[PDB]
Amino acid sequence: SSQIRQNYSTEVEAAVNRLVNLYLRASYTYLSLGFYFDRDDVALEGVCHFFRELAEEKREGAERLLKMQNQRGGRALFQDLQKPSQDEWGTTLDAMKAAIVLEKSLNQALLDLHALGSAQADPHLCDFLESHFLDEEVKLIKKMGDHLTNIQRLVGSQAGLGEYLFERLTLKH
Amino acid sequence: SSQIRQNYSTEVEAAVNRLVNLYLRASYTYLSLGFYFDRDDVALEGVCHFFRELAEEKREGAERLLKMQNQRGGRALFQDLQKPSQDEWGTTLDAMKAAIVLEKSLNQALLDLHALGSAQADPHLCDFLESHFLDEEVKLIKKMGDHLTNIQRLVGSQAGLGEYLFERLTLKH
Amino acid sequence: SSQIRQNYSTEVEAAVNRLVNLYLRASYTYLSLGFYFDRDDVALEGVCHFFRELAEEKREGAERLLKMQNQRGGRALFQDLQKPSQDEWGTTLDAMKAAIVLEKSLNQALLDLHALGSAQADPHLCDFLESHFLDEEVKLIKKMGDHLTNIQRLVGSQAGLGEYLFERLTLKH
Amino acid sequence: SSQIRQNYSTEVEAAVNRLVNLYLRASYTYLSLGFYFDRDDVALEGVCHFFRELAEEKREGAERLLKMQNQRGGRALFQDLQKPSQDEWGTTLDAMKAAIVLEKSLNQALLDLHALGSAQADPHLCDFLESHFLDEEVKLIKKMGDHLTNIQRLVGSQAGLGEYLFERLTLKH
Ligand SMILES: [Cl-]
Ligand SMILES: [Cl-]
Ligand SMILES: [Cl-]
Ligand SMILES: [Cl-]
């Protein structure tokens, strides 16, 4: 057992393990989104790349949380990773909307954990979220909102054309 | 006559000469496709470049097969090269569909020859196809399928615009 | 739907999706093993690093399989990822034994899929496994067997000492 | 007197001076630990180096606190520095246990001051601790816990051997 644990509640420890599960599920969802856009009958490379990069970012978030859990003397505990909510993800617009919903749910989980840390007077936890998660999440959601607006303006009456142009001229490929 | 030939059936030798003919015909077809898209009344440079590059790749496939034929102690035999099936190739979409049909026929010829090699217990032949042809063909067909989907999404109700944009923003020029 | 699919059976497609699940589960198991050895009350950095590297390798194997699925015109389908079989992994010896068992199960899944590919006359699938998985797996299992033998010789009557020395002098840190 | 002081309570000012005393005492304790392990009849250079480095780190922590005190318009006040609690520090294990106890007491002092800063609505103080002390302290305690576990596993039935090996193969020398 730990000889280091100090000011680290069982409630926070458990919530950290739940958040790890949420980040890994998000990673898995992004893996599925990425491979959908790589299908020969979808074929939007920039969109594929965007979601593959997010799968990696979310995995890295989970790893940082697990590292912190150990640094504090908590015990990492893993649960089943539920499959993503969809097998096919529709249009780029459908996918970017689903991504924003996912990100808002993760952001709310971060905020909930920050509030728990504040209530438990755990400033290391609070600082850790502030320093590595909260601003990164606000930036990502701003970026997704920006994309969504551009996708929306391009639908118009020529949806295929707009979907191609967004992928070619906004997303990295 | 050969002093080297070993485990190399007459059936395989003949099939290799037929495949050489098929690759050279494919090369010739791609030469014609390339020069069609270079016409002043077609003028799609990226499309021209794509097919010219494929003419070269298919010629190189034929040369590798002829080199292998000699390495095994078979006898290269050449036949008439039939002219391509069309003198004019329609739209970029028409051309990319015709290319996928051609590639599937070549892929089936590779698979047929692999099966013959397996039946004849000729592992060098089988390995040679695996190492230099089968994956290259799967990759090319994936690429063509990706292009076809993008061309298709761009037709919409403004076909000229979409054909220009695909050439400008997807194909190398 | 796919315009590219050729010689790619539904049986192989399904088996590829199952193998992806197996690789991702293996990745998850290695993630858990790695974080266990990072605990302050275990504290074997070289062992942690070894398993973290394997988590990454297994994820990359899954990604290669998913890429290939798309190249062939199959449909990636994801299932629930079961949690690892243990929450605590015992000694370095216990962990390396569990890793070898896992690797043998993955190797058997690769062999089973190769046999299915041979029966279905799918040489691209067979080549793909040969080129990227089968030798990599044999090498890894040889390496694990080598480690296991060294761990075993070091138990003797001073288990702590031997566990420390293996981590310090064999594993990268 | 200060023309700059703003939102900086007398309670915080006093607690900052006490924390400076605690950091300087910790520095002094580490100086003594370092020179003990440099004795010809102890002679564990890696252990000496570890504690000498910590003496320097704790002095630097004190200096940062004194700099901040001035930046806020508080008045640095120094008290007697009590000698360390021991003149001889036993084994490496005894020393690393004593170091962890010391570090936990410093960590609790940081947490107490953070709580005081929160209660007094002094966000600069709170941020200052978060940014320069709280994570540094968690990392150091994790490192000490890791060392303690390795020292403990090496005692076994050959204590001298284990103490030598830890110093040679874990600590920098
Ligand atoms: Cl379960
Ligand atoms: Cl003739
Ligand atoms: Cl389900
Ligand atoms: Cl005095």
Measured between beta carbons, the chain C residues lying within 8 angstroms of B136 are none
Distances (CA, A) of D129 to A11, C68, D9, D111: 24, 51, 16, 9
- Taking phi over 0 as left and psi of -120 to 50 as alpha, with beta for the rest, D79 belongs to beta
How far is it, in rounded angstroms, from Cα B169 to Cα C100?
A: 49
Q: What is the distance between the alpha carbons of residues C168 and C173, in angstroms, rounded to a whole number?
A: 7
Chain D touching partners, 3 or more CB pairs below 8 A = A, C
Which residues are registered as beta bridge partners of A81? Answer: C81
**In a 3-state reduction of DSSP, which class is residue C81?**
strand
Q: What is the resolution of this structure in A?
A: 1.6
Q: In whole angstroms, what is the distance from residue A99 CA to residue A55 CA?
A: 11
Comparing alpha-carbon positions, the chain C residue that sits nearest to A67 is C35
Task: Please indicate whether, in this complex, the C-beta atoms of A80 and C80 are within 8 angstroms of each other.
Answer: yes
Most C CBs within 10 A among D143, D150, D151, hence the mutation to make, goes to D150
Alpha-carbon distance A146 to nearest alpha carbon in chain C (angstroms): 29
Residue D92 Cα to chain centre, angstroms: 17
Q: Consult the annotation and say whether A88 binds a ligand.
A: no
Q: Which chains touch C (3 or more CB pairs under 8 A)?
A: A, B, D
* Neighbour-count burial for A93-114, b at 16+ CB within 10 Å, e otherwise: bebbbbbbebbeebbebbeebb
- In sequence order, what are the residues at sequence separation of 6 or more whose Cβ sits closer than 8 angstroms to the Cβ of residue A25? A81, A82, A84
For residue D80, is it left (φ>0), alpha (ψ between -120 and 50) or beta? beta
Interface test with B, best of A42, A45, A164 (most B CBs within 10 A): A164
A46 touches chain D (CB under 8 A): no
User: Quick check: helix, strand or coil at residue D2?
Assistant: coil
Whether A65 contacts A13, CB under 8 Å: no
Residue C85 contacts A where some CB pair is shorter than 8 Å: no
What is the distance between the alpha carbons of residues B156 and C4, in angstroms, rounded to a whole number? Answer: 22
Look at C32 and A82 and tell me if their CB atoms are within 8 Å: no
SS3 category, C77: coil
Q: Which chain D residue's Cα is nearest to C43?
A: D146
Would the CB atoms of D145 and C169 count as touching at under 8 Å? no
**In degrees rounded to 5, what are phi and psi of residue A78?**
-105, 145
B129 touches chain C (CB under 8 A): yes
What is the token pair recorded at C51? 């398993």
- Cα–Cα distances in angstroms (integers) from residue D124 to residues A128, A129, A141, B153, in the given order: 17, 18, 28, 56
Q: Report the amino acid identity of residue D124.
A: H
How far, in Å, CA of A32 to CA of C20, rounded?
A: 12
Contacts of C60 (CB under 8 A, 6+ apart): none
Instruction: Answer for the pair C84, C32: CB distance below 8 angstroms, yes or no.
Output: yes
Binding residues of D for Fe cation: 53, 56-57, 60, 63
- Could you count the other beta carbons within 10 Å of the beta carbon of residue B14? 14
CB atoms within 10 A of CB D85: 12
Q: Tokens 């590219």 label which residue?
A: C4
Q: Return the residue of A nearest to D133 by Cα.
A: A124
Measured in residues, chain C has a length of 173
Separation CA A142–CA D25 (nearest Å): 48
A82 touches chain D (CB under 8 A): no
In the structure encoding, which two tokens stand for residue B55, read together?
Answer: 């003419």
Q: How far is the CA of B78 from the centre of ligand 2 (A)?
A: 9
| DSSP H helices in B82-134 | 92-119, 123-129
Cα B79 to ligand 2 centroid, rounded to whole Å: 7
Task: Say if B115 is an interface residue toward chain C (CB within 8 Å).
Answer: yes
How many Cβ contacts (< 8 angstroms) between chains A and C?
68
Task: Name which of A160, A139, A141, A158 is nearest A149 in CA terms.
Answer: A141
Residue type, C131: S
Chain C residues in contact with A35 by the CB 8 A cut-off are 66, 69-70, 76
Say yes or no for a CB contact (<8 Å) between A158 and B157.
Answer: yes
Cα of D144 to nearest chain C Cα, Å: 9
Nearest residue to B23 via CA among B110, B96, B88: B110
Report whether C112 contacts A118 (CB < 8 A): no
Which residue segments constitute the domains of chain A, with CATH numbers given?
Answer: 10-170 (1.20.1260.10)
| Contacts A2 to D, Cβ<8 Å | 145
CA distances (Å), B35 to each of B46, B168, B171, D2, D31, in order? 12, 18, 16, 85, 83
d(CA A57, CA A23): 9
CA dist D38 → B32, B105, D42, D43, D53 (Å): 85, 80, 7, 5, 14
Q: Tokens 């420390």 appear where? A: C164
Residue C79 CA to ligand 3 centre (angstroms) = 7
Q: What amino acid is encoded at A76 in this protein?
A: A
Helices and strands per DSSP (H, E), number in chain B: 6, 0
The answer, for C119 touching chain B at a CB cutoff of 8 Å, is no
Q: Residue B146's closest CA among C78, C73, A151?
A: C73
Q: Do B145 and A42 touch (CB under 8 A)?
A: no
CA distance D12 to D106: 16
Residue where the block lists tokens 């102890």: D42
Let me know how many helices (H) and strands (E) chain D has, helices first: 6, 0
Please list, in sequence order, all residues whose beta carbon lies within 8 angstroms of the beta carbon of residue D9, skipping any fewer than 6 positions away.
Answer: D120, D122
Which residue in the block uniquely carries the two structure tokens 């953070």?
D114
Chain A contact set for C28 (CB, 8 A):
78, 81
